[PDB]
Paper text:
While Pa-ExoY requires actin filaments (F-actin) for maximal activation, Vn-ExoY is selectively activated by G-actin in vitro. The catalytic domain of NC toxins can be divided into subdomains CA and CB, with the catalytic site located in a groove at their interface.
On the basis of these structural data, we designed a minimal functional Vn-ExoY module (residues 455–863) by removing the C-terminal disordered residues 864–895. This Vn-ExoY module (shortened by 32 C-terminal residues) shows similar catalytic activity to our original Vn-ExoY412-873 construct and allowed the determination of two additional crystal structures: (i) nucleotide-free Vn-ExoY bound to actin-ATP-LatB and profilin, with a sulphate ion in Vn-ExoY NBP (Vn-ExoY-SO42-:actin-ATP-LatB:profilin), and (ii) Vn-ExoY bound to actin-ATP-LatB with its NBP filled by a non-cyclisable ATP analogue 3’-deoxy-ATP (3’dATP), at 1.7 and 2.1 Å resolution, respectively. This corresponds to a distinct conformational state of Vn-ExoY NBP that is more competent for catalysis. Vn-ExoY undergoes significant structural rearrangements at both the CA and CB subdomains between its nucleotide-free conformation bound to actin-ATP/ADP and profilin, and its 3’dATP-bound conformation in complex with actin-ATP. Near the interface, the CB subdomain of Vn-ExoY undergoes the most drastic global rearrangement with a large 25° rotation as a rigid body around the hinge regions 532-533VnE and 662-663VnE. It thus acts as a lid (hereafter referred to as CB/LID for residues K533-M662VnE-LID, corresponding to K86-M209PaE-LID in Pa-ExoY) that closes on CA to stabilise 3’dATP binding. The conformational changes induced by 3’dATP binding bring several regions of the Vn-ExoY CA subdomain closer to actin, increasing the buried solvent-accessible area (BSA) of switch A from 338 to 707 Å2, reaching the BSA value of switch C (810 and 766 Å2, respectively). In the Vn-ExoY-3’dATP-2Mg2+:actin-ATP-LatB structure, switch A ultimately contributes to the stabilisation of the nucleotide base through interactions with M726VnE-switch-A. Mg2+A is pentacoordinated in a square pyramidal geometry by two aspartates D665VnE-CA and D667VnE-CA, and H753VnE-switch-B, which are invariant in all NC toxins, an α-phosphate oxygen of 3’dATP, and a water molecule.
Numbering used by the authors:
A (entry chain A): 4 to 40, 51 to 371
B (entry chain B): 466 to 863
The structure:
Amino acid sequence: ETTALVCDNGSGLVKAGFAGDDAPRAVFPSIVGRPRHDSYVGDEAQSKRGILTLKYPIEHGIITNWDDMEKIWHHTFYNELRVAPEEHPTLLTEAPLNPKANREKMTQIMFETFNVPAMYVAIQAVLSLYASGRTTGIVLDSGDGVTHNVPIYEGYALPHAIMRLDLAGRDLTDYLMKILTERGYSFVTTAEREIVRDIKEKLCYVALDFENEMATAASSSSLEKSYELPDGQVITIGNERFRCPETLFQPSFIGMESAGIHETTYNSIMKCDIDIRKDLYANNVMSGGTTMYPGIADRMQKEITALAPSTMKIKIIAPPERKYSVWIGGSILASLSTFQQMWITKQEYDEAGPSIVH
Amino acid sequence: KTYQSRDLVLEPIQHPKSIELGMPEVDQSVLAEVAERENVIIGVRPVDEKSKSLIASKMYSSKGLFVKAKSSDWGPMSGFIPVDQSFAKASARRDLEKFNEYAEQSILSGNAVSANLYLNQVRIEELVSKYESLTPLELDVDSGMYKTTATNGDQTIPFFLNKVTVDDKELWQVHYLREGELAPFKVIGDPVSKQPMTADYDLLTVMYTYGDLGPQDKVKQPLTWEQWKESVTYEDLSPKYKARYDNQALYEKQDGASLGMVSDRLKELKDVINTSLGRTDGLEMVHHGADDANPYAVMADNFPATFFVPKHFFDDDGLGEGKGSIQTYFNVNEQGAVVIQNPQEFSNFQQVAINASYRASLNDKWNSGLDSPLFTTKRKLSHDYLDARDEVAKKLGL
Ligand SMILES: Nc1ncnc2c1ncn2[C@@H]1O[C@H](COP(=O)(O)OP(=O)(O)OP(=O)(O)O)[C@@H](O)[C@H]1O
Ligand SMILES: Nc1ncnc2c1ncn2[C@@H]1O[C@H](COP(=O)(O)OP(=O)(O)OP(=O)(O)O)C[C@H]1O
Ligand SMILES: C/C1=C/C(=O)O[C@@H]2C[C@@H](CC[C@H](C)/C=C\CC1)O[C@@](O)([C@@H]1CSC(=O)N1)C2
Ligand SMILES: [Mg+2]
Ligand SMILES: [Mg+2]
Ligand SMILES: [Mg+2]
């Protein structure tokens, strides 16, 4: 009668908890800090920042530093969840298009290093769709390091139509730091990057009509907002509020030749069977922290409508808890005891090796 | 007009009742605005109705964690904190030895002083005429003082009021019979101003949107000034925290042990609340963490509670499509305070707020004394989570 664990390994945040719960118990930064002349994970690494070099083990949703990822998982089990991993089946999440060698290495660490009794690896965007009570639809999942379009039909992702856009939250914060120089402000350091991330989360929004919003900001101060820095200094933000998330729709703002999130969504639906397109258009689910901008669902509704045939019903589902939809979907999946079938047991790993995950 | 969601059925309130609250109406209005501005649900534990004019006057400071002795809710000492805790509210008279020791230690350690109790004519009129807590004053000729009586519960105790002139104000000093002898009544006063302290506003809980959940929601145990210094990097702190890093006395007074078990969200919201109330520089009403993190929580002493919610809860179908408004199912007063009268009604309110995307923090001590443990992780699961799980199980053949 052991409770399964659910761990969403994000480029910026790790979300961890127990299957059966409606929210993760632990949410902390995906960072490992080493003294700058023995190791800190998450909150403590950020808190002790001034005396640590910080590293991100996950780049663009993909685990790249396995030794640092082991520290994150050890901290998740022993310090955050306070569980013994050998007693809990563990569901881990992966980015769409995660290389086979990566999930095999992930499987090898779970069984050999943590000795889990069983494990399952789920695609992050598929879990978001489950969190909204659906098994068919198209997910736009945009987090800290990467953005994806994942069309899903009856529980299964359609791999040929998956779209990856490297633009995500961190690039938007870097872009906000950059365009803030255009009003005389200078944010450059790692600590200053965190102040800009906070300005972005609090004051940014997606304009329904970008050009009209730029005209309004240019001729009046009605769209301006004040923001108090930690040291008491008050700064003013104007058109940067909507220019920053506009990059999702116009990636050329940051030098990227890629199509915008509205275009990748449409192109993704167009790569799917005609008989299923109506089901994707009516079930466009948004998830991840970078879809949290006010006005993003309405802007996506307007943009998809202009691209899709007039007879098509377009619906954007953007739940208030969409920053945690991937974790929620993993909790739903791992708590259905009738799903104790697709889990890879430790006995099966001992016989077949890491390839059993495929 | 009926709230129906899974096993939760709520009927509209028939004949809404007026509930007296001790929190001044202006303070309720401020907290209603804080809830809207900050987009959080703020719950505050009861304040006795007779503390209202004391708190509203803005004259007194209030008791934080270092003053665990209870306020009194009866007699001439109503709203103040008696040094002899047999004159305090019933929870204190229940464990008299423990509460008398708290009162004494708070004074002997310098966290409070022993002050005399002076009541003006206005407070005497309030106690005699408005609340009927004291019987009319009878001129006892054998002392010069004016005799009055009060009930604690089954017993009637006499008090003697003496007219005095202190700091050019005409007041009544409270006296009582200490072992068959007339003695000045003592109350706990502020260690700096020496004036009697009133009860505080104890946060019952703060419910934050699911979208804003993060590291600031981690409840932390108090740290010593040394341990806190080592855990933070000076350069990243605000002027408020740099001052505490450079001054041990400032840290111990406004942080560490003085807050108890608290999250970063709550530390900041406490400052927002006190600033919005105009309660700074020693007159703060919120001193510590919420009851949801209190290991010594007593569920029976948590009601009636006042809840302050974001304004969309009062809109047509504010609770969601076809669910109606908060005031339809819970009693809401003129200031926008949702008055929660018992554990069952608090359990219903929490489930409604959780379904509307506001996160609960559950204290297991809240289940102590209940017929059934309403405040558990499983019983408080969001209905969107449970419905999506039902749908996925049905659709995937699971
Ligand atoms: N309210 C908000 N408004 C705008 N952006 C936000 C908001 N909240 C979070 N973000 C951004 O979302 C990111 C964190 O979200 P999330 O947890 O979904 O990412 P992740 O899972 O770590 O990353 P990935 O899935 O891309 O590997 C950060 O860029 C953060 O700044
Ligand atoms: N977050 C917390 N962490 C640790 N202890 C806490 C926390 N919240 C409350 N406490 C404990 O509960 C106490 C709060 O109650 P307190 O204000 O002293 O009395 P009360 O029951 O409200 O009556 P009066 O205020 O005296 O009228 C103080 C402390 O002993
Ligand atoms: C509050 C919070 C937010 C977040 O999303 O944090 C994650 C993880 C974080 C790691 C470094 C930082 C100093 C530590 C903790 C902050 C965690 O980096 C991020 O802020 C990066 C850099 S700026 C940006 O937008 N993303 C995202
Ligand atoms: Mg993610
Ligand atoms: Mg109190
Ligand atoms: Mg208190």
